[PDB]
Symmetry: C4
Amino acid sequence: MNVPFWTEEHVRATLPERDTYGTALLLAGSDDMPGAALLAGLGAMRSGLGKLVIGTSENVIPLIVPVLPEATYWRDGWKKAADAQLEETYRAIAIGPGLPQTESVQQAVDHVLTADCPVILDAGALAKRTYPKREGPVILTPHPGEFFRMTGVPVNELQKKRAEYAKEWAAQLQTVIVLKGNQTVIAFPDGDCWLNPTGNGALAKGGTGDTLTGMILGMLCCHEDPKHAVLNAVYLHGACAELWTDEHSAHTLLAHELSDILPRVWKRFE
Amino acid sequence: MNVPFWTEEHVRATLPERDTYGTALLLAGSDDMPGAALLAGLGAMRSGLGKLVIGTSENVIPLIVPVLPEATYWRDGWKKAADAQLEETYRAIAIGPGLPQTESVQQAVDHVLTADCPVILDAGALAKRTYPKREGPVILTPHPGEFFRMTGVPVNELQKKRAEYAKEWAAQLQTVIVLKGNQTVIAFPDGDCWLNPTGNGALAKGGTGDTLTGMILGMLCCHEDPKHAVLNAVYLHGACAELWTDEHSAHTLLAHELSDILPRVWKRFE
Amino acid sequence: MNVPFWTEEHVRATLPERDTYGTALLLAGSDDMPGAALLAGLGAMRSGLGKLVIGTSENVIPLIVPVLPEATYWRDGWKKAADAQLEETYRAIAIGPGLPQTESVQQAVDHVLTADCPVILDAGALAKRTYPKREGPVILTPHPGEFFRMTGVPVNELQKKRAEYAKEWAAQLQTVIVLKGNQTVIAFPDGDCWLNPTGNGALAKGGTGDTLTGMILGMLCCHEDPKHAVLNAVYLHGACAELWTDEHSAHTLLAHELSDILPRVWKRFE
Amino acid sequence: MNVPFWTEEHVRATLPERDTYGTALLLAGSDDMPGAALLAGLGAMRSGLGKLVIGTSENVIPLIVPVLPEATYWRDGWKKAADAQLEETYRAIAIGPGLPQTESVQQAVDHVLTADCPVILDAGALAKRTYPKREGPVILTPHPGEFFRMTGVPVNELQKKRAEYAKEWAAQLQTVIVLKGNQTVIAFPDGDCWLNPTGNGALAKGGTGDTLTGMILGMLCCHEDPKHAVLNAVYLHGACAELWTDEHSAHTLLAHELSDILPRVWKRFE
């Protein structure tokens, strides 16, 4: 379909200066899958927000603090979000990393969507469903298996026509779809669509998607244009893996290290 | 008002040699806001004290130890301080980071103020109130929103005349006021007033104020002149952010890293 | 016996490219010996797997997360494995590091062996026993004392004829035996046998065997040939200690650092 | 008294090669003072032992594991040692860092002294007492205030004649005394006495003594001559502070960093 790449030149032209930067909400991490909250939290705080509130399970909080003492907490927030509309205003919200694929998580999604801000759905928050007309984009970040869960398009078919399917479903759902893989597709509901040119096989390991979700969350808080936030996050996330492989084997990357590398990588694009 | 900058030359002339160094008390961190205690604790121990006692909530202690095993503890100290005068002597005391804005915290402030040492109030310990005549300076570290809470001066007005307001209120309250922002103002109750020339937008993220409070606390323990301690802490805290941005994006700094950078930055001024 | 060395040339010829990478199961760590799970987990995730599930004791989970937030968990998995066959499919399984030498651990071994994948037994999972005919190699990683436990060959005798004993018992048991020591022996049940040429005395400290077990586990997930996975893991584990001693005393290595060094060492062999 | 310095030439001549290395027991860390166990544990494992068992309070264990996953544990060991003789054999034992100054700690000291190995007493294990004739040296590591507690020699008097007092009391008690300060004195019960030439004011902060105790413990496990172990530990501990101050301010060192620096410093003396 000749989908263009979001190139270095586009990144440089669109990344913000740091001369407020928003407050983000991260609804992530469960007793059974705690690490996703730390990964997404580090990605978000590394990515230019002003404040982060992590609504994680109570028993997950103590696992984050020593690594990310800059985050604050909404105790059992992802569970509380199932029961009522948020009362605080956030610049952007992410939900899903480390959450189970349950109806209660979808109830929290429904409540989060009544806020007027960009919302990211990932992992356990991804389901076959439709989305309400609202202010603010909804950004879905499926791996191909999650895309199958969302759409019924089998993975072996999806992978032959990734951009065509991503574009079709972004239009049908009226959501942004970041369809992960080699050459991640970023499809917008208005029909714009891009391929990401960065990254390598070092990213094909658990946790790298949690880091990406956090990076998007933070970038939404420092870019005025949420489209550029999404594109720049996907781009820089892959550029971190590429920097890693200059001196380290691609087999050996741990996701949290992408966050650790981002400071230097981002500097290069300023 | 032509407020002078506290310059490199002033810093070099006033930083102490390490040829006792005091015991500090840090009353910080609550179950709901734990990270502030780790941030302020690292800042304090990095800043030239001899010993640190952290009076944090019992459930916060285990979150600090693996990162800062050099600190010792007064279990639930900030809560116990509400009920009685301190029995141990400290070289300096800080109260507030990660504490709620409650009457019980003000009761602890009242008790801490009966000690004969410099005392720093930050975050939850900042309120609209007056201060008793005592030995030792009281040092307030408000962001503009906290200054509004203290004084009723709205933020949009404050920000047009920052040094004039800081100076006026330092005189009226007879406290030191470190009014944070770009060009942080350091106003003394005797009418001396300075602007800080260091820092950048990397500091505009949660946790950097907790780190600063700790840095002031530690510097009070190694400088004979508490005025120089405050000025040097504010200066070096900003100089750490500047060093960071040489090779890292200003969007990507985490507060704890200021503490990690301070060793090298301080060396340059010796 | 003229056993050949698995040399650099063999390593280079056999290490995989990262152009799925498997899901591994690690059954390790107990309340009394928790650290082995973190060591083996880091080794495994550093070594090219796609996903890691750690079946550790419930109280050990929170000790791993802040260091390795990329792992997921099967709560009390090593204990649950005593009662039933695994229902999920894994590319490879390791059992033993930090587990007690008990009958219940052997019950878990028996159940794990009904899976169709390579299985590694280490530490508490090593016992005097025989092994069922199955699909997938069984890989034993004894120190000489554990070899004595397995075979009744006293250590002072073993150490005079290490490769002869390792070869004899690999044949008799029909298992791979990685007999650790200076010049670790890798003996296969088909009679192939190699010596490892890398390593030094820095490895003669607690925890380095836990790291090795993890490294083998991960390498089994990215090599098509499990024999090459075992050989390359033993080789690279020793090569990490050698890199360490270039600028650091051999007395001072901590096992987890082998995992930290592996990224750079592996790169050199690509 | 013309006490000689233990110089670089002596260190080089006496440090061991790493071509067993012993199992050490560390009885340290209490709920109220947990960090000392992590500091002493890191120092010990960094210092050439083969295995470390940490007998700390149950609630302190989880605080050590993520930082030092190579250690194993004797749960509530320092408390259990009050009730009975040790049943396991250790190459060396340390007791005291982070322990209260109580009779129960002295009961544990009494029991530990029935073992046939070098024993180090520090911090809460230091008291006014005498010592039984035994195999293995007893090594006391007092700061001047602890020396006052041990002997009744006031600090202001002690500090005028440090080596004379240390020598006199080492002879009277028949213990090694490492009397800390600038120019730490190492006095042996046979009348040998040395001054340490390394170190600086960076060491005058909480936790550095816990690190030293651990370093001595580990060095006792890799030196055949326990006198050289003590001397080399004190020397290298100070040499780590000196390396630190080359690029970092002496005000800013954290004790755990001495352990982190030791690998490189030790290499220089090989």
